[PDB]
Design a protein around this motif. Structure first.
Motif, PDB file in Angstrom:
ATOM      1  N   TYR A  55       0.837  -1.233   0.000  1.00 43.96           N
ATOM      2  CA  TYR A  55       0.000   0.000   0.000  1.00 43.96           C
ATOM      3  C   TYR A  55       0.866   1.275   0.000  1.00 43.96           C
ATOM      4  CZ  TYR A  55      -3.707  -3.365   0.528  1.00 43.96           C
ATOM      5  OH  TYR A  55      -4.559  -4.407   0.324  1.00 43.96           O
ATOM      6  N   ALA A 112       2.895  10.012  -4.536  1.00 44.58           N
ATOM      7  CA  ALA A 112       2.668  11.439  -4.855  1.00 44.58           C
ATOM      8  C   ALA A 112       2.449  12.221  -3.550  1.00 44.58           C
ATOM      9  CB  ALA A 112       1.514  11.616  -5.811  1.00 44.58           C
ATOM     10  N   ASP A 142       5.735  12.834  -1.647  1.00 44.82           N
ATOM     11  CA  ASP A 142       6.520  13.898  -2.330  1.00 44.82           C
ATOM     12  C   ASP A 142       5.897  15.272  -2.035  1.00 44.82           C
ATOM     13  OD1 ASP A 142       8.201  11.957  -3.228  1.00 44.82           O
ATOM     14  OD2 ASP A 142       7.452  11.926  -5.281  1.00 44.82           O
ATOM     15  N   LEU A 143       4.569  15.419  -2.138  1.00 41.32           N
ATOM     16  CA  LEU A 143       3.882  16.719  -1.884  1.00 41.32           C
ATOM     17  C   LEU A 143       4.179  17.188  -0.456  1.00 41.32           C
ATOM     18  CD1 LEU A 143       0.531  16.073  -3.729  1.00 41.32           C
ATOM     19  CD2 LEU A 143       2.012  18.039  -4.123  1.00 41.32           C
ATOM     20  N   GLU A 167       7.756  18.418  -0.261  1.00 43.92           N
ATOM     21  CA  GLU A 167       7.887  19.651  -1.080  1.00 43.92           C
ATOM     22  C   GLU A 167       7.244  20.848  -0.368  1.00 43.92           C
ATOM     23  OE1 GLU A 167       5.954  18.133  -4.491  1.00 43.92           O
ATOM     24  OE2 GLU A 167       7.608  16.835  -5.050  1.00 43.92           O
ATOM     25  N   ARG A 175      -5.867  13.554   1.755  1.00 45.34           N
ATOM     26  CA  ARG A 175      -6.796  12.469   2.173  1.00 45.34           C
ATOM     27  C   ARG A 175      -6.842  11.398   1.088  1.00 45.34           C
ATOM     28  NH1 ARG A 175     -11.406  15.241   2.318  1.00 45.34           N
ATOM     29  NH2 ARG A 175     -12.198  14.210   0.442  1.00 45.34           N
ATOM     30  N   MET A 182      -8.280   3.753  -4.931  1.00 44.04           N
ATOM     31  CA  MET A 182      -6.813   3.892  -4.819  1.00 44.04           C
ATOM     32  C   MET A 182      -6.275   4.869  -5.878  1.00 44.04           C
ATOM     33  SD  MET A 182      -5.163   0.392  -6.297  1.00 44.04           S
ATOM     34  CE  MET A 182      -3.492   1.034  -6.196  1.00 44.04           C
ATOM     35  N   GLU A 186      -7.450   8.015  -6.409  1.00 43.66           N
ATOM     36  CA  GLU A 186      -7.809   9.414  -6.060  1.00 43.66           C
ATOM     37  C   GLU A 186      -7.019   9.888  -4.838  1.00 43.66           C
ATOM     38  OE1 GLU A 186     -12.097   9.980  -6.015  1.00 43.66           O
ATOM     39  OE2 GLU A 186     -12.259   9.368  -8.112  1.00 43.66           O
ATOM     40  N   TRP A 202      -6.929  13.365  -2.508  1.00 49.10           N
ATOM     41  CA  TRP A 202      -7.625  14.637  -2.205  1.00 49.10           C
ATOM     42  C   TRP A 202      -6.637  15.620  -1.572  1.00 49.10           C
ATOM     43  CZ3 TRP A 202     -12.427  15.474  -4.006  1.00 49.10           C
ATOM     44  CH2 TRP A 202     -13.141  14.364  -4.449  1.00 49.10           C
ATOM     45  N   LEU A 203      -6.429  16.780  -2.187  1.00 46.79           N
ATOM     46  CA  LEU A 203      -5.467  17.787  -1.691  1.00 46.79           C
ATOM     47  C   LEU A 203      -6.199  19.111  -1.497  1.00 46.79           C
ATOM     48  CD1 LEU A 203      -2.655  19.103  -1.199  1.00 46.79           C
ATOM     49  CD2 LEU A 203      -2.544  19.396  -3.673  1.00 46.79           C
ATOM     50  N   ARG A 230      -9.596  16.899  -6.434  1.00 45.69           N
ATOM     51  CA  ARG A 230      -9.573  15.442  -6.698  1.00 45.69           C
ATOM     52  C   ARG A 230      -8.447  15.186  -7.700  1.00 45.69           C
ATOM     53  NH1 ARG A 230     -11.777  13.203 -11.208  1.00 45.69           N
ATOM     54  NH2 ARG A 230     -12.373  10.992 -11.280  1.00 45.69           N
ATOM     55  N   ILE A 231      -7.305  14.725  -7.211  1.00 44.86           N
ATOM     56  CA  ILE A 231      -6.141  14.378  -8.069  1.00 44.86           C
ATOM     57  C   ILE A 231      -6.356  12.941  -8.531  1.00 44.86           C
ATOM     58  CG2 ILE A 231      -3.641  14.138  -8.263  1.00 44.86           C
ATOM     59  CD1 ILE A 231      -3.372  16.203  -5.974  1.00 44.86           C
ATOM     60  N   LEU A 232      -6.639  12.779  -9.819  1.00 46.32           N
ATOM     61  CA  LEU A 232      -6.810  11.459 -10.450  1.00 46.32           C
ATOM     62  C   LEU A 232      -5.436  10.959 -10.887  1.00 46.32           C
ATOM     63  CD1 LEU A 232      -8.841   9.328 -11.255  1.00 46.32           C
ATOM     64  CD2 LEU A 232      -9.157  10.540 -13.419  1.00 46.32           C
ATOM     65  N   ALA A 249       1.929  11.832 -14.085  1.00 46.00           N
ATOM     66  CA  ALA A 249       2.603  12.830 -13.228  1.00 46.00           C
ATOM     67  C   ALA A 249       2.964  12.213 -11.867  1.00 46.00           C
ATOM     68  CB  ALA A 249       1.733  14.061 -13.103  1.00 46.00           C
ATOM     69  N   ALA A 268       3.658   5.942 -15.178  1.00 49.51           N
ATOM     70  CA  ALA A 268       4.077   6.026 -16.594  1.00 49.51           C
ATOM     71  C   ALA A 268       4.646   4.684 -17.061  1.00 49.51           C
ATOM     72  CB  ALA A 268       5.063   7.163 -16.795  1.00 49.51           C
TER      73      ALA A 268
END
Lengths: 366, 367, 368, 368
Positions: free
Chosen positions: C130, C138, C141-142, C145, C270, C276, C278, C280-281, C294-296, C300, C305
């Motif tokens: 998981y 992601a 990293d956020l 950052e 969140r 798995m 999505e 949420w920022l 909603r980050i799909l 990126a 990739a």
């Protein structure tokens, strides 16, 4: 202080009463005077005049409408009496708050439209789904170029109040005594939202269906005459494309007026069943790119008058308080109210054009 | 014989009470309560808001509003520090009381008020309006009916971000003597009111808390924030069942996120106040269609039918207060007990103050 | 030369590892690992699955498999009780180890494994799958950052209902002895793997735990459930930051609800494993457009990739295992560090056992 | 005996086919297909990708892939422009064909191919990824079983934004003769494959279409976009029931939003590919609990159990192609029909081309 007459003590009557009662509480100024409530039986009018806070109840709506202590009439009665009661009220020099529809026929709405100009009185049609803070914020966002140029509209209004085939035949399911089916109960609301977002309709091509064709009547069957559902392709006067549907037999849906405007620089999306959420996509940096969930709060038009803190859900009934306020301000010449009988007639012509298109299998132009 | 209403305060909850008193008869029938006296400062504000709110008069003197012979019931929506003084005066003057949460700054004050209410023979109710939604009331009835079997866990939270901005200036409400509790006071008490209504009384709490922004702008300088921005607790109920609890006034992106879940041996109920028209019910079903149901608020749920006949016409936050007003109206007319009164309310004051105590000492607290 | 692969266990995590090993070079490039030997019981089962999994041979003797000269790395997906013995044998044979959780039933056993792993100088990784989703990576990293400023609160849960039915039979997994931990062992360890990756090390826990169904059908009678059905804990991180934590094997309607959120000084992240794809920022924005994004999942995000060039083509549970394979592959080649190794894994074992102790004693447990 | 596989193309769908072929036996059992020949240009690219994909050899000679005696089946995933030449050559050489949509750029080419298929006696399938999800296959069975009574309305969309950026350069794919249809060709066909699987065959379409970005950068100048960015249609099915249909490659914020809904006399089914693990089912119920069900994809749904035993472990976009491979595998073995073959595929090509014709002529198009 506005003198108020209310006709109809049904659920939309009560919706109007609740709006008149709190319009000054929310928006300030002088509370309107609740002069006369009209309904039948007369014991009825009296019971609800007491609890609704009207000075007197009357079973004579014609007396109510001509009362000199009255300035504005709310009409919330059955659809077939809309023309009669509206023109009578305009004739008596009263402003009119008219529940949809204007009338069953385009011909009747047209007479109403001419009668309204001639009266020099304010009119507004009860298209309450144009009053949510979310919807009004969507119009302002489009006007600020938030999604660039609109290139496509997709809207629907699904409910399931007629889905149960055991529900009895009524004179409302007749062309003559009811007029339109789903296009009349729901289509007109979707049009009111759609033209507010995309501008006027130039053309429709529509299909429609009667899904439950026969219903229990007395001991037997009676035939359902109007559509349970309809869909249409739209061309807006702008040249932009549209998709449109309504249904009163869409199982699981209770108030699913849902719409989406796709633009050159973004997308707005909304669902009335979650009326406190507006979805906005604008291109972002790849790492954080995505739709925003805008939760209704005081940054949106109207909300601050009801609650100073965001995320305290605005309700269906508070839409009607905003609609009352809009009419108050128009009557005082402090802002135009939409839609009047002139704008309203246009909506009536579009839903009737959709019905005509589905019947003839040909496109209808406006 | 219409209910005579005094309103003290015209802020968030002040205006909320005013809109509830105005339309309670419209929604539920009977005689419209008479809006007699509105009290607020200064005098000019009391007069203008009395006019637009439909009160017979406004006054800068709350003691005038409370003692007026035409007044039968007093809505108190002033700062938490004046609650005890105003509530006790109302009861002493023989008036029923609608008191905004919280009862007072301290359990001691709440203890004194609870004695006053019992001795006054007048009806009291605290304004825990999140217990009034059709969705919440439906969930309480579903649990009682065995819809989720035996409750085995509660998980609750109340996130808002009204204090997340560190430049948001200092105020006496951020001190312990003049403000009392922080997030436990503003948000925690709402979550306890929902939590004990779902799960029954609290037996034990173990809590931790934090002040995230310790110093705020104070007239060119800076002043210390003494109370908690957020708190979390582990709960045992009198039932023996487990619970998780939290609140925060610094949870960025959340505006009214009172969210809870009751897990049972035969199902699960889930709710989020930011979507106050949705109740999520899982019950076991055949594998092909097994899944949570989205119950959209409609006439099947308590209170809804008084405002709208058709489902999916979203019930509003402010309509919660019309229900609350009606519950007090019916209690006053001896037609049903209102919850919570000062007795029921003092229990909620003990729980949130026990949580604050547990966070300070690092020890569990029992009830 | 291609990585030589041994796999032990032909159950569902075994199948998951086989699928990962088969496509890791397809996704990430380089040489396809050599599928050399597959071990399970019975030997017909192992010869059957060796054929369909594309392994050169099957065997009922897993010691054989781990000692094979053509083997460089051993995937251990067998039942929890054999992990210590099988990991230690693989390290003794100078093989790298990909180990399904847990390290062992006891901290004491995990401690011995941790010393063996430092002695062997081979790479190890625990199967905390998981932590491999593009969305989770992601989020990490956020946070690093500064996208949500300083973390001020963590809230995490892991609800499933595979034991919710009181009809479901007893088994040796519900004993402390043969099963070890309950919900904390099956689910808690996953939540810890995600939680410490987001907030850093745990300093302190205060925990509660319950067995809600105390007895289950067994040979026309009943037998007692010894381990916890659910547990909750308040956390203090080494950072000083607060946390909420829970797990449950009896949470009705949940199938894989590992859901967490990091509240920060400048935003909120969140995530729910059941969706798995999505993330949420929330970050402060101007009032008119303010709200959660909603980050799909798409190219990126880390790893995506290698599987698909277009966003919104949902990344799957099984693809987490391909990412895990590639991480161990790169670590074995010395071009990157695989987390967690037996050292980082032991800390996770100590946290879940510390939560169990706290629940038993009604007292907090310190780790630092 | 193991199926001999040739693959032509290594892009998006090429690599997707490669991952499917590599693990189909791992998921569904039997013998791993032999990855014999990978074909792509240039040769050095076909050589590296054959190595990492696990193909015995790579070539820039695509005819070698369809003519090799050790090849039984050919995955064809290259530019649609050579689909007819390559598919017809593979059929003439006695190979089965797994053809990535579309069949060809024109109905005429598709018609010739369908004739070639009938005469060939080999199995064909058109790659329609979105018909293979556990949720979609579950929806079809629920409809067949009467779960929503008689279907009365279909509403479907396929929104993506891959062309929304007006600076995206012109390409041969934006020409009528070298690209064929625009959004109807890239997305429409997919929505049709799902739509006709739910509602049965299309009798009539009335369509409209739009080019939102009419011109694009062409090496210093600009060239005209000849095909549609978006199109909508009203449908009459052979059953007489109504439908709404749209697609767009300029719908900002959407990445794979193939969303559909079937409203029936006794319920409603609703699905969004961007959340491909969720199927929403409404059936009339008790007023106190009445509402839509969120069905989380799990082992009760077709194909899922081959990938994972535990519900809520999200099935991925790529695993749809593993299911597609298995369907072709079973059909080649005579153990089941694969849908859609070149005959079923031709119908789908006629429907989308009929929509394009309807939009151009402003007349309905009927189908017999």
């Amino acid at each position: 202080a506005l003198g108020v007459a209310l006709i109809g003590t049904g659920f939309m009557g009560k919706c109007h009463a609740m709006a008149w009662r709190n319009v000054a509480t929310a928006f300030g100024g002088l509370p309107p005077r609740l002069e006369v409530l009209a309904d039948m039986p007369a014991d009825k009018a009296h019971s609800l005049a007491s609890s609704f806070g009207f000075a007197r109840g009357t079973a004579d709506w014609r007396e109510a409408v001509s009362d000199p202590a009255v300035d504005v009439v709310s009409i919330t009665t059955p659809n077939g009496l809309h023309r009669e009661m509206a023109e009578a009220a305009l004739a008596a020099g009263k402003h009119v708050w008219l529940e949809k529809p204007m009338a069953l026929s385009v011909e009747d709405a047209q007479a109403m439209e001419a009668a309204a100009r001639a009266s020099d009185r304010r009119t507004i049609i009860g298209y309450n789904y144009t009053r949510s803070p979310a919807f009004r914020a969507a119009v302002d966002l489009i006007a600020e170029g938030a999604i660039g140029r609109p290139i496509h509209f997709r809207g629907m209004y699904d409910e399931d109040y007629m889905a149960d085939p055991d529900l009895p035949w009524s004179w409302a399911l007749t062309r003559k005594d009811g007029g339109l089916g789903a296009l009349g109960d729901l289509g007109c609301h979707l049009v009111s939202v759609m033209v507010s977002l995309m501008g006027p309709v130039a053309r429709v091509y529509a299909q429609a269906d009667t899904v439950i064709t026969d219903r229990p009547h007395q001991g037997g069957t009676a035939r359902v005459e109007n559509e349970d559902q309809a869909q249409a392709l739209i061309r807006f006067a702008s040249g932009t494309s549209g998709e449109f549907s309504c249904s009163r037999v869409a199982r699981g849906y209770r108030c699913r007026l849902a719409w989406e405007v796709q633009g050159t620089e973004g997308t707005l999306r909304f669902d009335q069943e979650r009326m406190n959420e507006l979805w906005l996509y604008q291109p972002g940096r790849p790492e954080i790119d995505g739709f925003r969930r805008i939760l209704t709060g005081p940054a949106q038009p109207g909300f601050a008058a009801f609650c100073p803190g965001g995320g305290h859900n605005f309700g269906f009934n508070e839409q009607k308080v905003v609609e009352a306020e809009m009419l108050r301000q128009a009557i005082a010449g402090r802002g135009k109210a939409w839609p009047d009988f002139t704008d309203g007639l246009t909506i009536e012509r579009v839903i009737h054009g959709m019905a005509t298109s589905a019947q003839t299998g040909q496109p209808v132009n406006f």
